[PDB]
Symmetry: D2
Subunit: 326 residues, 4 copies
C-alpha cells in the first residue's frame, strides 16, 4: 500500500493551509478530499458574500486582493485554486476517507475512490481537517425527508411566487430569507429563539428587521416545527400549533462535526464543552500523532473557529511533526 | 375539468411573450411550466453572458435596463420575474404537461403536478412553447450513461486539476472549454467537423484559437468518440483510434425539440430538418388550433430562432386566436 | 423667441418626473438643463451605491429592475437615459437658465448655451427643479480655496498613502472615509456634531464605527476647522487647537439651493434654512405660476426630500397647471 | 538627495522595475507626477483589460480574478496592494523636470505638489514615462475648443448628442461603442482606407456590426479639416463634407516625450519614434540611462504592453547589480 509521511483528511481552507505549513518545513503531505478543493465554499449559495475581508482568508502568503471590501464565493474559489496551483499542494480529489486505524507506529487509512474502488495508505501522522458542513442538524420531524425540504441554500430564483419557510435564526437563515424576498417568494421565518439572534451581522440586521416589522417577512419567534407535508407546515409557539400553507422549506438549522469519525480513531471528546481533546500549541489530539485543523476543533459553539483563525492550526502541526522528523 | 381559452406549454421567454401578446387581445391565458419561469435560463452556466443586447430580450414593453452592454444570466432571471409580476401573467409552475388530445372542438391537456397528482384541463387553443434545452443530442456511445458524462455545463470549479473532454463544436462547447481552462482543468476538445463552425460567435473564437495555438487546449478535428470508461476515452480520427486518460466528459453536442411530444399531438415534422409544419403568419401548425412559439419552431442545427425573433411569435398567434374568438 | 407652455429648469430625476407628469395631462414641456440629464448623479462618486431600492427611483412607470438589492450610479445613469428616450422628454441640454422675469401673464426666460450665445423663451409656467448639488456649503476658513480642498468626492485611488481629512457627518462623509480607507489613505474625520447623524445608513455605520474603535480612522466629534495649509490642517475641539499633517481635504459639508436664482425671479426664501415658500398641495411658490420640484423644496439641509418622494411633486404641479390650462 | 537609481514614472512597468531592483539589493526611488498607476487611473471608467490578470502581475504578487479579464478598478486595487506589500518607495505628486549628467552621476530636477523644487543626484536613471500623457495632436483649426477631447472617460453626458470619434485605434473603437451604448449619435472618421489591423479581433465584430446596420456612420480615408462649435468638416476623396457636431473625441493615439529623452542624451532615430537601446540591458545610447515599459516602443506602439514591459526591470536590475 502507498506510504505517506502525513495524510491530511479534507481539502478545505484549513487543510490546505496545513499542507503548505508542512511544505515550509520540508514535508510534502497528501491531502485526501472527497470532492474537489474547498468543497464547502463550492457548496455556498451561488452569490454568497463572505463576512471576512479577503486578507483574512489568505493562506500560504498568497495575496487575495479584491476591489470590493468583502469577497464573494466565486472570488474565493478562484483564489484557492490559484493557491493550490502555485504551491503544488498534493490533492487526491474525489476520494473519501472511510477509516483510520493504528498499525504499529503508523496508521492505515482506507478510502473509496470516485469509481467505487477501495484504496489503503500507510501514514506516520494524520491531520483531520474535515469541517462540519457535511452534517446538518436534522430536526427529526415528519416530512423533513420530502424533496421540498433542504438543509442548504443555493439560489432564490426558482422560488418565485412560492410559499417558502426558512427555519433558523442565524446568518444563514437571514441571508436565505433576504435572497428569497428579492426573488419574489413569500417568506416565513421560524426560529426557536425568542428574539433576534445576537449573531446576525450588524450590517444585515437592519434590512431584515425592517422587513419583519412591516410584515413582509412573516416571523415566528419561539417556534418549534412539528410537521411538514407537501402543501403545509405545522409549528408550535408556547405549545399552541399553527398550520400554514407551504411549498418549500429551507431548514437552516446549522451543522455539527462528525465526532464518531474522531472517536473511532482514538480521539476523545470533552463533554460539556463539545471539543475534541487537544493541546493548542501542537494542535495534537489525545491520540498520539493524530492532529486536527480547522472547525473540526470547535466545541458546542460551532462559530468559535472559522477561516481567519483556523488557517493557523497547521503552523503548530508542522512545527511538531518537523521536530519529530519522519 | 378546469376550462381555459388558451393554454401555453412552457414559460420560457417566448411562451411568456405569447401570454402577454394574448393579453393585448383580451385573453389572459394559462402558462403551464414544469419548473419555474425561464427554467432554461436558470439552468444556463453560472457565468453565462448573453450574446444579445438587453433590449432584444425585452417582452411586454417592460424595460430591461443594463449598464453593461450585454446582460448576464442573473440579470435576465431578475428581468423575467419582474415581467411576470408586472404583467400579471398566469403561471402554473412545477407542473409538467404530459398529453394533449383533441376531444371535440377543444383539447384535453393532462398534467402532473409537483406532488405527483394529475390534473386535466380543457382548452380551446394550444401554444407549444417548449424549446429544446431539455433534450440533448445523445452521442450513442458506450459509456455515455456514466455519471462522469454530462450533456450540460454549469460551473468549472470542481474540475480543477482534472482531465476533461468537451465534445462538440457549438458555441456551448467552446464556452465550456474556456471556462474549464479558467478553472484549471486539463481540457481536450473533440469535434467531428474539420474546421471551426462558422456559428461560433466571432468575438469568442479568438480566445479559443489562441489556447489551441499555444498548446493549452488539445484540439482534435474529425474526431469521433467510440467509448467512454471511468478513466479513459477512445476516439478515432481518419479511422485511427486513440485512447486518452479522462476523468469527466462534457458532451456539448447541442439539443433538439421534443418531436415525440409534437407528433403525439398531431403535428407533422420534416424528417431532414427537424422543423414542424406551420404557417408563419399564424404560427399555427398543421393541427388546427395548435400553435408554436419560440425556438421549438426551428429546424436543422438551429441558429435561426432565438429570443430576439422568437419573442414575436405570440403576436401572430394572438391575432389569429382573436379573429376566431370575436 | 421660443414659446412654451411650461419650462422646467433642471433635468435631474425630479425635473424629469415633472415633465412626464405634465405629459400625462397633455402638455409636453421643455426641460432646460445646464449639463446633460441627471448631471447630479453623473457627478456622484464613481462607485456610489444608492440607499433606495431601484423601484423607488422609477419614474414614468419605466421599470428599473436590478439583480442586486440597491442600484449603483452607473445603473441609474442608464435608467434615466432610457426613461428620457422612451418617454420622448424634450431636453435642451448644455443650456444654463440665467434669469426668469415676469412679462405680462407669462415669463421671459434667458439662458446661456454651450457656445456662449444667449437665448430667450416665453413660458406660461415655470418649474424650478435645480436641486442643490451645485452649491456647496462653504466653510469660509483660510486655505479652503487651495486646490488640495474639494467639496465633492469622486474616487479614492489617488489618495493612496496620503494623509486625508474628511469634514462632515452625513452619509457622504462616511462613504468617502470608507472608500479612502479601502484605497490606502490615512483618514481623519472631523465633524462639528457630537454624535453620529441619524441619517447615516444603518447598514454602513457599523463598519465605520468598527474602524474608529480599532484606530484605523481618527474621528473627532465637536471639531471646528480653523485653518488649512498645503501640508497641515488646524482644528479645535472644546476650544483646544490641534494641528495635524494633511495632504488633501474633502469638505463634505453638504449643499444648498441657488438662492440668488430664486429670489431674483420673485420667490421668497427663508434666510436661515434656505427653503422656498410654497403650498404643498400645488407645489407653487409665493410667486404665481412658479412651481418647484425636487430637493430644492427642502433647503440648506434637505434630507426630508429625496427621489423617493420628490418624484411625485410633478403630479401636484401637473394637476394645477392642467386645470389652469 | 542621493539615491543609486531613480525611476521616472510609477506605472506598472516602473513599479516592476523597482521590485526587480529590490531583488538585487537596491531599494530605488520612484518619482511619479500623480499617484501610482496614474495612467490606469485615467483609463475610461468602463475599461476592461485585453490581458488576463496573470499577465499583469508584478513582483510575484498574485492577481486573482473570478472573471477572465480584469477591469480598471481591479488593477488599481492590485497595484496599490503591490506597492504596500513590497514597500516600494514612491515620491508621489512630483514631476521630474530635467535629467542632466553631473560627473559620473545625474542631476534630476523636480517640481512638487506645492510648487517647490527639488534636486536629487542618482547614479542610474530608468525612464518609464509611457506615452499616455502626450496625445497625437491633429493640428487642425478648432482642436483647441473645449468640445474636443483627446481622452475618453465616460459616455453618459453625450446622451442624445452628435459626437465624432477620430482615429483607428482600439481606443477609438472602444469610445465609439461606449458612446453608442450611452445614446450618442456617433460618426467615426479614420484616415485609413479600411478597418485598422490593430483592432482586437474580439472587438472589431461588434463595431463592424453597428456600421453595417447603420447605427455608426463610418468614413474611411477621412481627413478632418475644421471643427466649429456646431459643425465639423472633413474631406473624403476630394469632396469636403460638413456635418452637425456637438463633441469630438480625437482618439489618435499617443507618443513618448521625445524632448525629455533627447535633452538627457537619448537618441530617437527619425522615422520610428523608438529610443535607441540594447534589449539585453534595456540601456539607451546614453550610459546608465535605461528605459522600461511602453516608452521603448516605436511607430508600432502596440509592440510593448504590460505583459512584456513588466520584465524590462529584470534586464535593468541585472545590469545595475553587475556595475555595483
Ligand atoms: C455561507 C457561509 C459563509 C461563510 N463566510 C465565512 C467568512 O466570511 N469567513 C470565515 O472565516 N468563514 C466563513 N464561513 C465558514 C467557513 O466556511 C468555514 O470556517 C471553513 O469552511 C472551515 O474550513 P475547514 O478547512 O476547517 O473545513 P471545510 O472547509 O468544511 O473543509 C472540510 C473538507 O473536508 C472534506 N471531507 C469531509 N469528510 C471527508 C472524508 N471522510 N474524506 C475526505 N474528505 C472529507 C469536505 O469535503 C471539505 O472540503 C462561512 C460559511 C458559510 C456556510
Ligand atoms: C448558454 C446559452 C446562452 C444563450 N444566449 C442567448 C442570447 O444571448 N440571446 C438569445 O436570444 N438566446 C440565447 N440563448 C438561447 C435561448 O436560451 C433560447 O433562444 C430561448 O430559451 C428560447 O426560448 P423559448 O421560450 O422558446 O424556450 P425555453 O427558454 O427553452 O423555454 C421552454 C420551457 O418549456 C418548459 N417545458 C418543456 N417541456 C414542458 C412540458 N412538458 N410541460 C411544461 N413545461 C415544459 C421548460 O421547462 C422551459 O422553461 C442562449 C442559450 C444558451 C444555452
Ligand atoms: C452620493 C449620493 C447618494 C444618494 N443616494 C440617494 C438614494 O439612494 N436615494 C435617493 O432618493 N436619493 C439619493 N441621493 C439624493 C439624490 O441625488 C437627490 O435626491 C436627487 O438628485 C434630487 O433630484 P432633483 O431633480 O431635485 O435635483 P438634481 O438631481 O440635483 O437635479 C438638478 C438639476 O438642475 C440642473 N441645474 C441647476 N441649475 C441650473 C440652471 N441654472 N439651468 C439649468 N439647469 C440647472 C443641474 O445641472 C441638475 O442636473 C443621493 C445623493 C448623493 C450625493
Ligand atoms: C484603455 C486602455 C486599455 C489597455 N489595456 C491593456 C491590457 O489589457 N493589457 C496591457 O498589457 N496593456 C493595456 N493597455 C496599455 C497599458 O496602459 C500600458 O501598456 C501600460 O500603462 C504601460 O505601463 P508603463 O509603466 O510602461 O507606462 P504608464 O502606465 O503610462 O506609466 C507612465 C507613468 O509615468 C508618469 N510620468 C510621466 N511623465 C512623468 C514625469 N515627467 N515625472 C514623473 N512621472 C511622470 C505618468 O504619470 C505615468 O503614471 C491599455 C491602455 C489603455 C489606454
Ligand atoms: Na430554529
Ligand atoms: Na462532435
Ligand atoms: Na462638520
Ligand atoms: Na484618423
Amino acid at each position: 500500500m502507498q506510504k505517506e509521511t502525513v495524510i491530511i483528511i479534507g481539502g478545505g481552507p484549513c487543510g490546505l493551509a496545513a499542507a503548505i505549513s508542512l511544505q515550509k518545513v520540508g514535508i510534502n503531505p497528501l491531502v485526501i478530499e472527497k470532492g474537489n478543493i474547498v468543497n464547502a465554499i463550492y457548496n455556498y449559495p451561488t452569490h454568497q458574500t463572505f463576512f471576512s475581508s479577503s486578507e483574512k482568508l489568505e493562506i500560504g502568503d498568497v495575496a487575495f486582493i479584491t476591489e470590493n471590501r468583502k469577497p464573494v464565493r466565486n472570488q474565493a474559489l478562484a483564489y484557492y485554486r490559484e493557491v493550490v496551483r502555485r504551491k503544488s499542494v498534493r490533492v487526491n480529489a474525489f476520494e473519501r476517507v472511510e477509516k483510520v486505524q493504528k498499525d504499529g507506529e503508523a496508521f492505515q487509512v482506507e478510502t473509496t475512490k470516485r469509481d467505487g474502488s477501495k484504496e489503503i495508505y500507510i501514514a506516520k501522522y494524520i491531520v483531520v481537517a474535515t469541517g462540519y458542513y457535511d452534517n446538518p442538524n436534522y430536526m427529526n420531524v415528519p416530512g423533513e425527508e420530502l424533496k421540498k425540504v433542504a438543509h442548504y441554500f443555493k439560489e432564490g430564483h426558482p422560488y418565485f411566487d412560492r410559499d417558502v419557510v426558512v427555519i433558523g435564526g442565524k446568518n444563514s437563515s437571514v441571508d436565505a430569507a433576504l435572497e428569497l424576498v428579492k426573488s419574489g417568494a413569500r417568506v416565513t421565518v421560524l426560529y426557536r429563539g425568542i428574539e433576534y439572534s445576537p449573531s446576525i451581522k450588524p450590517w444585515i440586521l437592519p434590512e431584515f428587521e425592517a422587513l419583519v416589522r412591516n410584515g413582509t417577512i412573516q416571523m415566528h419567534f419561539g417556534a418549534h416545527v412539528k410537521e411538514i407535508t407537501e402543501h403545509t407546515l405545522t409549528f408550535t409557539v408556547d405549545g399552541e400549533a399553527l398550520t400554514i400553507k407551504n411549498d418549500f422549506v429551507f431548514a437552516m438549522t446549522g451543522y455539527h462535526p462528525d465526532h464518531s469519525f474522531l472517536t473511532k480513531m482514538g480521539v476523545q471528546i470533552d463533554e460539556e464543552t463539545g471539543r475534541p481533546f487537544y493541546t493548542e500549541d501542537r494542535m495534537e489530539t489525545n491520540a498520539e500523532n493524530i492532529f486536527i485543523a480547522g472547525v473540526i476543533a470547535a466545541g458546542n459553539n460551532a462559530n468559535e473557529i472559522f477561516i481567519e483563525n483556523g488557517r493557523f492550526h497547521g503552523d503548530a502541526i508542522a512545527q511538531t511533526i518537523a521536530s519529530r522528523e519522519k
